[PDB]
Design a protein around this motif. Sequence first.
Motif, PDB file in Angstrom:
ATOM      1  N   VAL A 155       0.801  -1.214   0.000  1.00 60.42           N
ATOM      2  CA  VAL A 155       0.000   0.000   0.000  1.00 60.42           C
ATOM      3  C   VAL A 155       0.850   1.287   0.000  1.00 60.42           C
ATOM      4  CG1 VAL A 155      -0.295   0.050   2.508  1.00 60.42           C
ATOM      5  CG2 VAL A 155      -1.957   1.180   1.026  1.00 60.42           C
ATOM      6  N   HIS A 156       2.041   1.246   0.591  1.00 61.94           N
ATOM      7  CA  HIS A 156       2.892   2.437   0.636  1.00 61.94           C
ATOM      8  C   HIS A 156       3.778   2.604  -0.605  1.00 61.94           C
ATOM      9  CE1 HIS A 156       1.582   3.346   4.639  1.00 61.94           C
ATOM     10  NE2 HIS A 156       2.050   2.213   5.128  1.00 61.94           N
ATOM     11  N   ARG A 157       3.693   1.662  -1.545  1.00 57.29           N
ATOM     12  CA  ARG A 157       4.494   1.715  -2.772  1.00 57.29           C
ATOM     13  C   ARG A 157       3.863   2.549  -3.901  1.00 57.29           C
ATOM     14  NH1 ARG A 157       7.341  -4.353  -3.199  1.00 57.29           N
ATOM     15  NH2 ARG A 157       7.627  -4.555  -0.940  1.00 57.29           N
ATOM     16  N   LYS A 158       2.743   3.203  -3.634  1.00 60.23           N
ATOM     17  CA  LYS A 158       2.004   3.901  -4.676  1.00 60.23           C
ATOM     18  C   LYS A 158       1.189   5.000  -4.006  1.00 60.23           C
ATOM     19  CE  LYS A 158      -1.639   2.815  -7.967  1.00 60.23           C
ATOM     20  NZ  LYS A 158      -2.574   1.802  -8.522  1.00 60.23           N
ATOM     21  N   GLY A 159       0.812   6.040  -4.731  1.00 65.78           N
ATOM     22  CA  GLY A 159      -0.068   7.073  -4.184  1.00 65.78           C
ATOM     23  C   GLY A 159       0.642   8.299  -3.629  1.00 65.78           C
ATOM     24  N   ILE A 160       0.082   9.480  -3.890  1.00 67.32           N
ATOM     25  CA  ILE A 160       0.676  10.755  -3.452  1.00 67.32           C
ATOM     26  C   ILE A 160       0.809  10.825  -1.940  1.00 67.32           C
ATOM     27  CG2 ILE A 160      -0.220  12.109  -5.433  1.00 67.32           C
ATOM     28  CD1 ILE A 160      -2.302  13.266  -3.744  1.00 67.32           C
ATOM     29  N   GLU A 161      -0.118  10.170  -1.250  1.00 63.60           N
ATOM     30  CA  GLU A 161      -0.045   9.987   0.192  1.00 63.60           C
ATOM     31  C   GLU A 161       1.352   9.545   0.623  1.00 63.60           C
ATOM     32  OE1 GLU A 161      -2.471   8.169  -1.613  1.00 63.60           O
ATOM     33  OE2 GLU A 161      -4.426   8.871  -0.909  1.00 63.60           O
ATOM     34  N   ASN A 162       1.960   8.637  -0.131  1.00 67.18           N
ATOM     35  CA  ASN A 162       3.256   8.076   0.250  1.00 67.18           C
ATOM     36  C   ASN A 162       4.477   8.844  -0.289  1.00 67.18           C
ATOM     37  OD1 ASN A 162       2.358   5.712   1.889  1.00 67.18           O
ATOM     38  ND2 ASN A 162       1.269   5.287  -0.014  1.00 67.18           N
ATOM     39  N   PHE A 163       4.216   9.990  -0.908  1.00 68.40           N
ATOM     40  CA  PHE A 163       5.251  10.978  -1.178  1.00 68.40           C
ATOM     41  C   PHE A 163       5.650  11.747   0.083  1.00 68.40           C
ATOM     42  CE2 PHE A 163       4.155  11.911  -5.955  1.00 68.40           C
ATOM     43  CZ  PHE A 163       4.478  10.590  -6.261  1.00 68.40           C
ATOM     44  N   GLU A 164       4.847  11.662   1.141  1.00 66.84           N
ATOM     45  CA  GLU A 164       5.111  12.398   2.376  1.00 66.84           C
ATOM     46  C   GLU A 164       6.123  11.664   3.239  1.00 66.84           C
ATOM     47  OE1 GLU A 164       0.741  13.801   3.425  1.00 66.84           O
ATOM     48  OE2 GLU A 164       2.222  15.255   2.617  1.00 66.84           O
ATOM     49  N   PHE A 165       6.996  12.445   3.875  1.00 70.96           N
ATOM     50  CA  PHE A 165       8.037  11.946   4.757  1.00 70.96           C
ATOM     51  C   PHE A 165       7.386  11.299   5.966  1.00 70.96           C
ATOM     52  CE2 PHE A 165      12.395  12.059   6.279  1.00 70.96           C
ATOM     53  CZ  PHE A 165      12.244  11.966   7.650  1.00 70.96           C
ATOM     54  N   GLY A 166       7.837  10.095   6.296  1.00 71.72           N
ATOM     55  CA  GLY A 166       7.340   9.361   7.453  1.00 71.72           C
ATOM     56  C   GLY A 166       6.077   8.548   7.259  1.00 71.72           C
ATOM     57  N   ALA A 167       5.828   8.080   6.036  1.00 78.40           N
ATOM     58  CA  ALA A 167       4.602   7.320   5.723  1.00 78.40           C
ATOM     59  C   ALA A 167       4.686   5.859   6.128  1.00 78.40           C
ATOM     60  CB  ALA A 167       4.281   7.427   4.239  1.00 78.40           C
ATOM     61  N   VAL A 168       5.900   5.344   6.248  1.00 76.37           N
ATOM     62  CA  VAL A 168       6.113   4.003   6.780  1.00 76.37           C
ATOM     63  C   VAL A 168       6.482   4.114   8.260  1.00 76.37           C
ATOM     64  CG1 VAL A 168       7.455   1.859   6.604  1.00 76.37           C
ATOM     65  CG2 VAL A 168       6.834   3.134   4.543  1.00 76.37           C
ATOM     66  N   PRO A 169       5.688   3.499   9.130  1.00 75.23           N
ATOM     67  CA  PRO A 169       5.914   3.631  10.567  1.00 75.23           C
ATOM     68  C   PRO A 169       7.174   2.920  11.096  1.00 75.23           C
ATOM     69  CG  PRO A 169       4.257   1.987  10.156  1.00 75.23           C
ATOM     70  CD  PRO A 169       4.573   2.594   8.826  1.00 75.23           C
ATOM     71  N   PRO A 170       7.787   3.466  12.167  1.00 75.11           N
ATOM     72  CA  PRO A 170       8.854   2.741  12.846  1.00 75.11           C
ATOM     73  C   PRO A 170       8.377   1.392  13.359  1.00 75.11           C
ATOM     74  CG  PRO A 170       8.902   5.031  13.497  1.00 75.11           C
ATOM     75  CD  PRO A 170       7.652   4.840  12.692  1.00 75.11           C
ATOM     76  N   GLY A 171       9.289   0.431  13.402  1.00 76.05           N
ATOM     77  CA  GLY A 171       8.953  -0.922  13.813  1.00 76.05           C
ATOM     78  C   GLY A 171       8.603  -1.853  12.662  1.00 76.05           C
ATOM     79  N   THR A 172       8.353  -1.284  11.483  1.00 77.70           N
ATOM     80  CA  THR A 172       8.233  -2.037  10.235  1.00 77.70           C
ATOM     81  C   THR A 172       9.470  -2.900  10.033  1.00 77.70           C
ATOM     82  OG1 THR A 172       6.992  -0.203   9.218  1.00 77.70           O
ATOM     83  CG2 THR A 172       7.937  -1.849   7.727  1.00 77.70           C
ATOM     84  N   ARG A 173       9.273  -4.192   9.790  1.00 84.38           N
ATOM     85  CA  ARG A 173      10.390  -5.120   9.654  1.00 84.38           C
ATOM     86  C   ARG A 173      10.956  -5.073   8.243  1.00 84.38           C
ATOM     87  NH1 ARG A 173       8.297 -10.291  13.062  1.00 84.38           N
ATOM     88  NH2 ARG A 173       7.132  -8.731  14.278  1.00 84.38           N
ATOM     89  N   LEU A 174      12.277  -5.213   8.138  1.00 83.97           N
ATOM     90  CA  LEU A 174      12.939  -5.329   6.847  1.00 83.97           C
ATOM     91  C   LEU A 174      12.610  -6.681   6.248  1.00 83.97           C
ATOM     92  CD1 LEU A 174      16.544  -3.867   7.230  1.00 83.97           C
ATOM     93  CD2 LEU A 174      14.458  -2.723   6.545  1.00 83.97           C
ATOM     94  N   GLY A 175      12.753  -6.781   4.932  1.00 82.67           N
ATOM     95  CA  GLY A 175      12.504  -8.027   4.233  1.00 82.67           C
ATOM     96  C   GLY A 175      13.679  -8.944   4.461  1.00 82.67           C
ATOM     97  N   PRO A 176      13.492 -10.249   4.236  1.00 80.66           N
ATOM     98  CA  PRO A 176      14.589 -11.186   4.480  1.00 80.66           C
ATOM     99  C   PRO A 176      15.725 -10.939   3.509  1.00 80.66           C
ATOM    100  CG  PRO A 176      12.787 -12.297   3.356  1.00 80.66           C
ATOM    101  CD  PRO A 176      12.312 -10.900   3.639  1.00 80.66           C
ATOM    102  N   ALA A 177      16.933 -11.313   3.908  1.00 78.94           N
ATOM    103  CA  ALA A 177      18.122 -11.058   3.107  1.00 78.94           C
ATOM    104  C   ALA A 177      18.619 -12.348   2.474  1.00 78.94           C
ATOM    105  CB  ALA A 177      19.209 -10.441   3.975  1.00 78.94           C
ATOM    106  N   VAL A 178      19.401 -12.213   1.403  1.00 78.22           N
ATOM    107  CA  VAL A 178      20.009 -13.355   0.707  1.00 78.22           C
ATOM    108  C   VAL A 178      21.540 -13.257   0.782  1.00 78.22           C
ATOM    109  CG1 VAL A 178      20.242 -14.561  -1.507  1.00 78.22           C
ATOM    110  CG2 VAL A 178      18.029 -13.564  -0.844  1.00 78.22           C
ATOM    111  N   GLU A 179      22.193 -14.386   1.082  1.00 83.83           N
ATOM    112  CA  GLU A 179      23.650 -14.443   1.328  1.00 83.83           C
ATOM    113  C   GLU A 179      24.474 -13.773   0.225  1.00 83.83           C
ATOM    114  N   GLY A 180      24.141 -14.080  -1.024  1.00 86.71           N
ATOM    115  CA  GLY A 180      24.756 -13.428  -2.174  1.00 86.71           C
ATOM    116  C   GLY A 180      23.703 -12.710  -2.992  1.00 86.71           C
TER     117      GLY A 180
END
Length: 531
Positions: A496-521
């Motif tokens: 939902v935060h990947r699109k829309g003028i709403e998400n042009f605003e600073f701070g639209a993704v809240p703190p505590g949001t988890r990062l996606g999993p990582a890959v070794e290479g």
Amino acid sequence: VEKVFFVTSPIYYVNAAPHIGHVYSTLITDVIGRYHRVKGERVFALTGTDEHGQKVAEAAKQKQVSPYDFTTAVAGEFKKCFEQMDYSIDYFIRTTNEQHKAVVKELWTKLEQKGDIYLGRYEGWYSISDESFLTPQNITDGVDKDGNPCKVSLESGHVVTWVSEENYMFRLSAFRERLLEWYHANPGCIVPEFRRREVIRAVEKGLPDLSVSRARATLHNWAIPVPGNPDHCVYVWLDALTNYLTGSRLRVDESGKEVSLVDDFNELERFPADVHVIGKDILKFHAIYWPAFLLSAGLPLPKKIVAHGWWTKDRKKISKSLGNVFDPVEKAEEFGYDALKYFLLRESGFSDDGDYSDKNMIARLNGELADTLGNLVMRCTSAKINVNGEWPSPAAYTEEDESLIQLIKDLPGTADHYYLIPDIQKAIIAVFDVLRAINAYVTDMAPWKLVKTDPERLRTVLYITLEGVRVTTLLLSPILPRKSVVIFDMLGVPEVHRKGIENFEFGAVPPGTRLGPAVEGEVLFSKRSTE
Ligand code: MET
């Protein structure tokens, strides 16, 4: 007024395989469409093939094939190329389409009923390769493929030929005053500005009437019949330009197939085009003829025509026979699809004829995509720095923090302006200017050191770094559609935060949001060596 954002590309002659020029034009159309979609607007992006005319008929004759089979084969090649290029075009139109043919006849009838078509003669020069009428001031001496002296177009260098024919003539001379009003009243309607100035200069000098039909034999009966006169065919250009109107009137199923033609364009809310993307070579057809046809027919005029330049490779003309090729799919497999698109869009603006080279391409890949952007994404997601793999909650902002936050907050308004000109190069430069700032901040703040020394400080630095990277990436997403998705996944940005003028605003993704999993290479953009 709220309507469907209608963006188009030129429909390309199918006399030869698709090459970089068509891809470039279609890319620009794709990027604009994509940006309006991320603003959350309704979009309809159009591209296609220009299949009638003497040029195409004669190319089909050279290959010893029927026009129907030749046009279908080459059109097939354009579709394959565009699919492989990974655009997001809403419809691919062919001028051989039967519904298109109906729209051309409707538009012609309007021109005739308005009194703007009469029977006359064209006696003058014509470039078949350009399908273009030319005055004697626009030709010069040159050489044909035999080596003999001939006349050639000053515009394009192609062989010209003297035509003397009874033709239906469109009263273009009568639209001089009205076209000038239009240019003056909408000073952003043609881009870039100096091409706008050319068009006015040309129309100021005066306009002749324009031949809109040709005798059928001259066209090898490969054209749309003039309504009420089977001896004539409709000028391929009047036919071609009409694709924009046809496109605006087609209902299209999820498979991308036209399933219906509506009577009134308003029903679909696309017409007129908000932006016509063209090359400099076809400016007159779009900026003079087209609006004149529309004014005659009582149709609305487009909002913007944007005309870009021609390409070179190593400061030379691109041609197989000349020994200087630039295959876009070959180059995308060698360097990456998003990377190649970035380069084409970053390297040249519309006022310039750009220059590809594997050297400069590698410099931008390494310099901007890997060192500036890729570097930054890995830092702010690194297990070493972001030890909890989350968006932390910021502490109090210093003035230096605030200077960066300001740049980020201002970025969308600025990038928005450039996209709307449209000037894609300037938008890219704006976003990367902010990315450079974020890198200098990170360097300044040394978050690797803060991990041990000052974790409360690290929270603030990291949060701003993540938020800069998200916002830059959102704005670069029309240009790096696949990579922007990777970036967002790594950052763990919800859909939902990947699109829309709403998400042009600073701070639209809240703190505590988890990062996606990582890959070794894993790497976003891997550097290329310098051989
Ligand atoms: C209505 S756009 C037509 C463009 C023309 N077919 C070209 O390839 O230059």
